[PDB]
Design a protein around this ligand. Structure first.
Ligand code: HEM
Length: 214
């Protein structure tokens, strides 16, 4: 369609379902998620966000990204640091896993940020908008299935404190995306990069499931 935001949603509809159907996510939705599995997901998110936010800072003033730069409203690295300290303890930095599938995702993020900057919006879209809307239902399930202590930590990642209304912010983000000027060719690559983002997540889910079933 005309608006990039609409083009992306329509183009990734198929892969999004694929992600929902992934064995690991199927069980997650059914409330069948273990602490070992959740820990792996949080570790994955930490690595992904460190890379994404490092690249966003590199291109924050570029015309190809500036319109969608919302550091205070969206940054997740600090939240994930707090969460991992809870799930893996004070020495989390020395023990969290960094698997091949996680590395593959991180690798593509740095390549885009350093050599194909105009495609970074595809990754910011996939991660932030997804976690902002989809992650909200997953948080509900997680807490009810994790039966964790009342220590007030572990799920900060699921709360964006600097966003008063998810729907209102998501409308704003879409508008900003639609203001990005790109040639039809670039637009096509952005669409494809978004699909690639979903595929990287799907391959990650497949790897995590394999690791947990021994
Ligand atoms: C299996 C668990 C998941 C569930 C139940 C879920 C659920 C949702 C829901 C309810 C929406 C709102 C749709 C709308 O009103 O437009 C949404 C949007 C979205 N999800 Fe998911 N999601 C899941 C996994 C994922 C994953 C793995 C990603 C990718 C990393 C993702 C990326 C997105 C994106 C980018 C949107 C934005 C759609 C738009 O452009 O408006 N989701 N998701």
């Amino acid at each position: 369609p005309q608006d990039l935001s609409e083009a992306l949603k329509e183009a990734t509809k198929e892969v999004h379902t694929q992600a929902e159907n992934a064995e690991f996510m199927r069980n997650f939705q059914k409330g069948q998620v273990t602490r070992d599995g959740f820990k792996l997901v949080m570790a994955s998110l930490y690595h992904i966000y460190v890379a994404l936010e490092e690249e966003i800072e590199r291109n924050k003033e570029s015309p190809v990204f500036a319109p969608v730069y919302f550091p205070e409203e969206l940054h997740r690295k600090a939240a994930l640091e707090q969460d991992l300290a809870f799930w893996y303890g004070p020495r989390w930095q020395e023990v969290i896993p960094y698997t091949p599938a996680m590395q593959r995702y991180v690798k593509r993020l740095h390549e885009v940020g350093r050599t194909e900057p105009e495609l970074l919006v595809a990754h910011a879209y996939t991660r932030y908008l997804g976690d902002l809307s989809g992650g909200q239902v997953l948080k509900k399930i997680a807490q009810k299935a994790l039966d964790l202590p009342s220590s007030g930590e572990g799920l900060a990642f699921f709360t964006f404190p600097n966003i008063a209304s998810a729907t209102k912010f998501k409308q704003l983000y879409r508008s900003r995306m639609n203001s990005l000027e790109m040639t039809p060719a670039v637009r096509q690559r952005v669409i494809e990069e978004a699909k690639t983002a979903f595929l990287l997540n799907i391959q990650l889910f497949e790897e995590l499931q394999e690791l947990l079933t021994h």
